[PDB]
Design a protein around this ligand. Structure first.
Ligand SMILES: *[C@@H]1O[C@H](CO)[C@@H](O[C@@H]2O[C@H](CO)[C@@H](O)[C@H](O)[C@H]2NC(C)=O)[C@H](O)[C@H]1NC(C)=O
Ligand SMILES: *[C@@H]1O[C@H](CO)[C@@H](O[C@@H]2O[C@H](CO)[C@@H](O)[C@H](O)[C@H]2NC(C)=O)[C@H](O)[C@H]1NC(C)=O
Ligand SMILES: *[C@@H]1O[C@H](CO)[C@@H](O[C@@H]2O[C@H](CO)[C@@H](O)[C@H](O)[C@H]2NC(C)=O)[C@H](O)[C@H]1NC(C)=O
Ligand code: NAG
Ligand code: NAG
Ligand code: NAG
Ligand code: NAG
Ligand code: NAG
Ligand code: NAG
Ligand code: NAG
Lengths: 513, 48
């Protein structure tokens, strides 16, 4: 196995007090895909200044992410005391095709101490620590997140210039405040700047040794290290897993200023990762020496399609999440960032299922429910649709009435009533796009505004919020063609809008640029 | 193995780290991104 070095020496662990309510903050950072935030550059290829579609794992454009903040522990006077940290060790998550993170984005600005926030200390970048693996379970005290068998460990040591990776078995310890003890609270790791990080001798084993004090390393099968140099600039990092093993990505090695990720390293492990957590960490520094740290963020990858704008220097500079909006769908269909003005069809709202209705004599109370769009089963016949009470058509006791295209038309219930079936209905959608002002509006077709609402329970695509930027303040407007959003009743007469809606309707642009 | 590292050239068969095809090479300017090694167009033809 790997030569891990010496075992832990002290038996007792420094106590970990959970102060998690101090860490509740709301500093969201949604992905800006027009800036190419979070984009993993494609593997093995590069391109010219041409725009191409691409498919791969990416963050959603609308995701605000998850936020975590490292902070100094308790100290008083001129000396260190006990840790006062966040409860992040209990935040077990299901792994889901990797994740990406944002690090140091609040650099060269100020924030607060958090644990004693009134001091208002300036903030600086700090690197994250992580643990990954195939299984989790209870600590002997019932605490969440104990990993089993072998797990990944990623930790910086001391100052951010050294990074280590491990695939190893963790071992519980019988010391006071440690995992086999009944005095255990929660796992944490720490750095002590009062003796660590000398400028002529940075302590390369600093965080690993504090890690060893809570878990003895055993049976380690892999270890790696990497070299980093200090730089307060914002950075991107992330993890994916394939049948070739885990991949590590960073923007630092290749594209430090543009922020595009590149495949920095790979790992030999072939075990599937099923769970993910963040290791909490804290600074042991003296009370007058405290320093606030920049916020850390996490976003989750999904197998999304995107337009990618490539620079002549091959950097991705802009991108569009195709499924984010109906307008984004339009751009992807024309493979461009500048669609010509017009009225364009976009995908329709579907239906929205309703709770099931079942009849099969031979469970309650679903015998009938008229009715909207409730899934159904009738003596092994199934489908989704709306039922209505109707007349009586021949022939009775054949039970299922059908049309010439073999669509079910209606049904004889065992309550003696004929009901008819219309399947379900949908709302067609189109958008009005004015390229000159870069503005838009929408049309719901013949649906009528009695079925239209500010939010949707159908549905089609994840948001329509760009319309809502003006339409949070207005009711839907009925027109002879149909219900529309953000149209306004100006009652103007004009010869040609270059955006006719059909009929005598006309969609004037707001006054020209 | 030698001496076939470069030959400019008209339409010589080639192999580049397991990528292969036939074509002419020319000493032109550089382009982004560096260290992705293979430059391609929108139809996935190798460009450079
Ligand atoms: C790279 O794309 C740019 C456009 O983004 C192209 O630049 C155009 O070049 C023509 C020259 O015939 C000009 O008339 C246009 O005004 C330019 N567009 C601009 C400046 O936006 C350029 O040809 C492309 N180069 C390659 C190698 O594909
Ligand atoms: C990574 O950075 C370290 C410096 O932190 C380099 O390792 C040291 O290089 C000096 C050169 O004189 C030696 O005196 C030290 O003994 C080295 N330390 C160790 C632990 O070997 C190292 O070269 C850099 N690169 C890599 C790939 O590790
Ligand atoms: C905080 O300080 C960093 C220092 O790393 C500054 O980053 C500069 O970012 C610009 C962006 O174009 C680069 O051109 C400079 O080279 C960077 N300075 C360096 C590397 O010393 C930046 O002024 C501050 N803010 C952020 C967010 O990084
Ligand atoms: C840790 O704190 C978070 C705060 O959002 C909470 O949701 C979570 O349940 C906590 N973990 C526990 C109580 O195990
Ligand atoms: C931890 O123990 C509880 C019982 O207190 C159990 O319900 C839970 O499933 C256990 N955790 C895991 C990951 O199985
Ligand atoms: C470790 O992996 C084995 C492999 O099957 C699994 O059965 C077991 O639940 C895991 N955990 C422990 C504590 O052995
Ligand atoms: C691996 O870990 C087991 C614990 O289950 C330990 O007993 C064994 O000595 C280790 N073996 C080697 C060869 O690393
Ligand atoms: C519709 O069903 C009602 C009971 O809900 C019944 O009284 C009525 O006769 C039915 N209408 C017909 C058969 O036209
Ligand atoms: C719009 O303006 C005209 C002006 O006469 C008015 O008659 C009409 O009721 C208004 N509203 C709608 C929904 O068309
Ligand atoms: C062409 O190649 C020569 C060497 O064969 C080199 O010196 C020169 O810089 C190249 N021309 C470029 C890169 O434009």
């Amino acid at each position: 196995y790997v030569d891990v070095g010496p075992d832990s020496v002290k038996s007792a662990c420094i106590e970990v007090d959970i102060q998690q309510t101090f860490f509740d903050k709301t500093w969201p950072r949604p992905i800006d895909v027009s800036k190419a935030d979070g984009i993993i550059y494609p593997q093995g290829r590069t391109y010219s200044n041409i725009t191409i579609t691409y498919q791969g794992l990416f963050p959603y454009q609308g995701d605000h992410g998850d936020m975590y903040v490292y902070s100094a522990g308790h100290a008083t006077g001129t000396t260190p005391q006990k840790l006062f940290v966040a409860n992040y060790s209990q935040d077990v998550k299901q792994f889901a095709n990797g994740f990406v993170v944002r690090i140091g984005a609040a650099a060269n600005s100020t924030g607060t101490v958090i644990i004693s926030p009134s001091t208002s200390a300036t903030i600086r970048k700090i690197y994250p620590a992580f643990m990954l693996g195939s299984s989790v379970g209870n600590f002997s005290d019932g605490k969440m997140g104990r990993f089993f068998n072998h797990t990944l460990v990623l930790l910086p040591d001391g100052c951010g210039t050294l990074l280590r990776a491990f695939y190893c078995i963790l071992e519980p310890r019988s010391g006071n405040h440690c995992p086999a003890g009944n005095s255990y609270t929660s796992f944490a790791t720490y750095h002590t700047p009062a003796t660590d990080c000398s400028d002529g001798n940075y302590n390369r084993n600093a965080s690993l040794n504090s890690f060893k004090e809570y878990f003895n390393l055993r049976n380690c099968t892999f270890m790696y290290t990497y070299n980093i140099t200090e730089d307060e600039i914002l950075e991107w990092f992330g993890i994916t897993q394939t049948a070739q093993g885990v991949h590590l990505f960073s923007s630092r090695y290749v594209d430090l200023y543009g922020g595009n990720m590149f495949q920095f390293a790979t790992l030999p492990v072939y075990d599937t990762i099923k769970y993910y957590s963040i290791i909490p960490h804290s600074i042991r520094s003296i009370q007058s020496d405290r320093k606030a740290w920049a916020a850390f963020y996490v976003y989750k990858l999904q197998p999304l399609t995107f337009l990618l704008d490539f620079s002549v220097d091959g950097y991705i500079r802009r991108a569009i999440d195709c499924g984010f909006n109906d307008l984004s769908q339009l751009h992807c269909s024309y493979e461009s960032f500048d669609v010509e003005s017009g009225v364009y069809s976009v995908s329709s709202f579907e239906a929205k299922p309703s709770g099931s209705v079942v009849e099969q004599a031979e469970d309650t109370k679903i015998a009938s429910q008229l009715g909207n769009c409730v899934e159904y089963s009738l003596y092994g016949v199934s489908g989704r649709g709306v039922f209505q009470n109707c007349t009586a058509v021949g022939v009775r006791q054949q039970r299922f009435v059908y049309d010439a295209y073999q669509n079910l038309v209606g049904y004889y219930s065992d309550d003696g009533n004929y009901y008819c079936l219309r399947a379900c209905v949908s709302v067609p959608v189109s958008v009005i796009y004015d390229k000159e002002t870069k503005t838009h509006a929408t049309l719901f077709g013949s649906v009528a505004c009695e079925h239209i609402s500010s939010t949707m329970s159908q549905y089609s695509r994840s948001t329509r919020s760009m319309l809502k930027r003006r339409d949070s303040t207005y009711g839907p407007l009925q027109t002879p063609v149909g219900c529309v959003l953000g149209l306004v009743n100006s009652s103007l007469f004009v010869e040609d809008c270059k955006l006719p809606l059909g009929q005598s309707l006309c969609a004037l642009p707001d006054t020209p640029s």
